Amino acid sequence: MGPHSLSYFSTAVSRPDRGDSRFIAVGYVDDTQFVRFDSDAPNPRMEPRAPWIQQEGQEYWDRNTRNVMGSAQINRVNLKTLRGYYNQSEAGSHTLQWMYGCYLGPDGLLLRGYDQFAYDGADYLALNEDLRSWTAADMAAQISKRKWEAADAAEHWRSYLQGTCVESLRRYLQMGKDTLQRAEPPKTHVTRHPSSDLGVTLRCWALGFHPKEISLTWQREGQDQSQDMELVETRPSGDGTFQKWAALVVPPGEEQSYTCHVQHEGLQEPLTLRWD
């Protein structure tokens, strides 16, 4: 079906104060985590974190465990390699992040693929959208780039992202149909709190919506008000749904001039909300 994604987010951290390193991976379909791996677990295995994924058999768990352990070992190595390239001390803790995955368009065909790396918070190396070449952030990443260009790592990635990634995503979308494939619209309200003598704060709330994308904007007489809008980060409820709010300070007595506009895939038509 429409916008869908399968993504894996991995994090390798060197720990010179503990003489070792740590690797963590999670997998997401859309906004829903379904598996994890942590090298600090005793008996570290790929683990289920959604009910629907547990009806995969042992060979799925075995294979995923083999492959994420393989990757953990190589990412252990990469951290050491990157220190060399950057000429860094052995005493600092460093972070290597890796995100890959696939995005299915509104027609359910593969629209984009990703495979990229960040070192100490900063973009390092990224598979281009053609899925035929790599972008490198600096001279260090040029070294990885040259190495991966000559080995044609892009082809192996292009095969994975167009084949197994999309097929897996489709099996997961089907296994988890009841939760992954229906959108829950937001429950909304508008609050009013006098916030100074001079001004009144209007807050437009959205609660209990999935998936997490949502548009909340304030309008007066057609013109948008995002200049002076405080918008919190969308945040998780803990039960699969999300919350957001947007607030605006308005002159007292002018409250009805202002409307909050809500767009979300769960809704039949966008809402126009007003303080009541």
Partner: peptide
Amino acid sequence: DFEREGYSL
């Protein structure tokens, strides 16, 4: 389905 890195940086 987790991909095994064949390549190292």
